[PDB]
Design a protein around this nucleic acid. Structure first.
Ligand SMILES: [Ca+2]
Ligand SMILES: [Ca+2]
Ligand SMILES: [Ca+2]
Ligand SMILES: [Ca+2]
Ligand SMILES: [Ca+2]
Ligand SMILES: [Ca+2]
Ligand SMILES: [K+]
Ligand SMILES: [K+]
Lengths: 105, 98, 79, 96, 96, 105, 98, 79
DNA sequence: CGTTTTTTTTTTGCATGTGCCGGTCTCACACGTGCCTGGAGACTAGTAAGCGCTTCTAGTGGCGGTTAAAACGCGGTAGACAGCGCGTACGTGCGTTTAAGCGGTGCTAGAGCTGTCTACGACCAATTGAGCGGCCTCGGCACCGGGATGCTGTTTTTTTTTTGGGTAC
DNA sequence: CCAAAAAAAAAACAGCATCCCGGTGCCGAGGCCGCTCAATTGGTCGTAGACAGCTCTAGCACCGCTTAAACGCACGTACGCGCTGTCTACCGCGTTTTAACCGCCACTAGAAGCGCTTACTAGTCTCCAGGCACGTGTGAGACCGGCACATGCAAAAAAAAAACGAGCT
């Protein structure tokens, strides 16, 4: 016995995802592709954040990602910012931004 | 004795707090206010410390965002001071307010 | 004066993160009113969740469910 | 012992090491990454859930997860996300 | 052909005649009134659904529909609505 | 002489709602009271709008409520306008409302 | 030789259209814009008549509400004339743009 | 360029319903830009709903479903 | 206190829109009709969840010292804001041009419906390893002090703008 | 032009904050372990939906009138905006007062888990009328005269509120 996730080339639990789709009252029946596809997408998006979030942390001179790194990552990427435009990241603060008219001459 | 021109510290303070992520409201007062406002909906209520922190992370985020949108309204009126009518316009256009 | 426990200097800090450089004295009280109407609207819903779960303790998840409803989804406290 | 609180955190760590092997993650930063997976899970699942009910169909297929992703994810994110899913399924259908 | 497309428009007419027995309704207006009932059906049903799921229960009861209405309807509307719904439950559990 | 609507004292079909609830993927099981309680709330809110729409109609010497009457009813009421703050009512126009500063002296 | 003063007819137009509910874009030039915009995504696409009506009801609704907000912005700047920056501030506070 | 079919006189009428009394000359090109994006962002999703149902005709329901996702729910086309 | 000017304000004078009656003509609300499918019923069976009973988590309250944060007051600059004044960007109102809107016909893509048939996913029981809670460790990172560096503000000096004479029509 | 007074420009200079480095010490990320329950496997059975075929709806194209609406130009008023100037609100920093914060201990509310038990809902097969499509009628309302009527502007009516004797204490 080897996991669906091993077969599909993913790090994300295809098994777990399948269960959550049945138990989540989304549809009567769940196809076999569905959880594999959904797992892949969650993994892809998870990769994209941790990619930029890592770079954020490296630029701080820090080993471990912290919420701010995730925030700097998300708010500076145009599309990730739009995807999470109605989402508050605890302990993330805000991007450094001072309106030009407020700086001295 | 040395004295900074009005707003040079303000600019400094902006830079300081835009760099950091700490909650800027004192925790105990905020928690009291959370309990006060709760008693309007039900008496003898208990709160998970996370539930209080969740609410403070939320309010603080909301307010910072509101001040950003406020500050834009002020500049739009060729000012540099935020006034209650910058906050009122901001919330009206957001659709928080009739 | 619990609402006043939200001090002038606290609000002034929040605005500096907001990148505000100058602040009318009328803002501090205005700000207190906005904040009160914010917690009221969340804690209302928050507690409606606590009630329906038949609990006397408000849980972070209650808050989280409430913020998601108010269109203010919050990350890093469950959900 | 305490009851079982499930989480995506072992898979986040896996992906992180693929992308940045020498990089760690705080407990909070992990909680954010969890909120994130569950958020988008619900978003895609629900949008698929709807697509199915709209087209009088009892089944959420991979095709529903795809259309849901083209509706939800902005531009390049949707394309890349759609590919990764389409790869993942093909590879899963070949091994059986 | 022409499907057999179910509506609310009879149960709307059967309420319009009760409040304002003199005055009627155009189609476009009855359309806006059909949209309305469907919107709010989904809002309430949807929140009840989550309410249930959060609390690990398998059944949506009048209690889930109640809390859902407390969350979704503003001040006065939420009270009156609770009543009419508590009223209707009691008169039904009377009538066998 | 019986029907689940008439036992609860309603014009909204308690049966229809109970089936919509089962079939609409919200929960495994639906309680008998749920569709009663719901039909009640949908009826009560429909009455509330019709009441005010027919008060805007009778205020135009109109026998028939049109979209504009529904809009007028919903926007001039503070609570209804909130509940439907993100809805567009088609052929509904906008409340007569001119900013004081734009008027003449 | 009669001449209404600048802004007198405007207030009439405001009053006139605020009274009515008719679409204020000519339907054919709109429909053409729909099909043009559509083409980009998928070619040889047909539209239900109602579908193009739903899209114009929406587009107009949206634009009227933006002018509402855009107007408040102009008033806030102690002006009476709506300008691009008025729109840009309305949409930045609304959340429709960065 | 059927966008130009959205005429100055038509934009002015929308503005007027929107209680506007006076109007910059730059607004007409601005307003067209905003309109195009609005229709792009709605149609793109409408046509996605068309494609999934495997049709060649965009239905009113397609648009209704799209508008609801853009947070612009529309009553009286099949809501 | 009056007595010249101005600065405000009151009442006509037409010219433009809505606001309003009477007819009065069409199409869409209204209701009736007959037929189909979705709600009703009584049945069995299983289990979802209410309840009672037990566990021990973590939420609450209190205390006393430290020091960072709030407070409150003094002072002065820089911003809000009111007034003025100038140039043209918009609004109004024609006379000219356009093409949308209307009603109609003619053609067919494709929306939508039906029946058939099977590949697919639900459900089941057995099997077992992935992933969980708990537990341990050791380096990343928070905290601190010390020195280098950058940026601010003041006072002095330099540079140019800017402004109040001294002749001309 | 002449010449003088500011207003900006550059300069040097002290000063205070911020940034970077190495050193220290604590704790939480990280990883290991052992048990557990959720995912996997392999089996059976039912039906959702894929597909082929047929119906016919309504989306498309085209045409030819009649305006209603777009367009373009002329002209001038009222607005946007730049400039200046005045008053103090708000910023900075100091000294005084407060209470948050921290760490800790003590107590127990109530969150949460488990077991039992049964009332409630899902599932099924039979029945049938409420609610559907389809189709015809008829009166609301939109349309189109003209007729008060309200406005709202071009002013002249006069009528108040200032600028200047007034001429006396
Ligand atoms: Ca009449
Ligand atoms: Ca077909
Ligand atoms: Ca293992
Ligand atoms: Ca009947
Ligand atoms: Ca009739
Ligand atoms: Ca007429
Ligand atoms: K507890
Ligand atoms: K380590």
């Amino acid at each position: 016995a080897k996991t669906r996730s091993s077969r599909a080339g993913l790090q994300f639990p295809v098994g777990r995802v399948h269960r959550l789709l049945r138990k989540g009252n989304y549809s009567e029946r769940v196809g076999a592709g569905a959880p594999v596809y959904l797992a892949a997408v969650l993994e892809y998006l998870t990769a994209e954040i941790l990619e930029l979030a890592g770079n954020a942390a490296r630029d701080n001179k820090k080993t471990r990602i912290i919420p701010r790194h995730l925030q700097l990552a998300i708010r500076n990427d145009e599309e990730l910012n739009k995807l999470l435009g109605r989402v508050t990241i605890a302990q993330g603060g805000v991007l450094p931004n001072i309106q030009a008219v407020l700086l001295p001459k | 004795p040395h004295r900074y021109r009005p707003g040079t510290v303000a600019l400094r303070e902006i830079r300081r707090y835009q760099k950091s992520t700490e909650l800027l409201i004192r925790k105990l007062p905020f928690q009291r206010l959370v309990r006060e406002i709760a008693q309007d909906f039900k008496t003898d209520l208990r709160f998970q410390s996370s539930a209080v922190m969740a609410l403070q992370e939320a309010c603080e985020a909301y307010l910072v965002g509101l001040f950003e949108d406020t500050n834009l309204c002020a500049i739009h009126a060729k000012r540099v001071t935020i006034m209650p009518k910058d906050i009122q316009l901001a919330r009206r256009i957001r659709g928080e307010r009739a | 004066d619990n609402i006043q426990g939200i001090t002038k200097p606290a609000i002034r800090r929040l605005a500096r993160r907001g990148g505000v450089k100058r602040i009318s004295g009328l803002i501090y009280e205005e700000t207190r009113g906005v904040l009160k109407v914010f917690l009221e609207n969340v804690i209302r819903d928050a507690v409606t969740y606590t009630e329906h779960a038949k609990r006397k303790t408000v849980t972070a998840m209650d808050v989280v469910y409430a913020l998601k409803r108010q269109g203010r989804t919050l990350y890093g406290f469950g959900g | 012992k305490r009851s079982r609180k499930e989480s995506y955190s072992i898979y986040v760590y896996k992906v992180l090491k693929q992308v940045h092997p020498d990089t760690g993650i705080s407990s909070k930063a992990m909680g954010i990454m969890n909120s994130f997976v569950n958020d988008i899970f619900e978003r895609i699942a629900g949008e698929a859930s709807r697509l199915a009910h709209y087209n009088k169909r009892s089944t959420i297929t991979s095709r529903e997860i795809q259309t849901a992703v083209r509706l939800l994810l902005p531009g390049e994110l949707a394309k890349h996300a759609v590919s990764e899913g389409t790869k993942a399924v093909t590879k899963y259908t070949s091994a059986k």
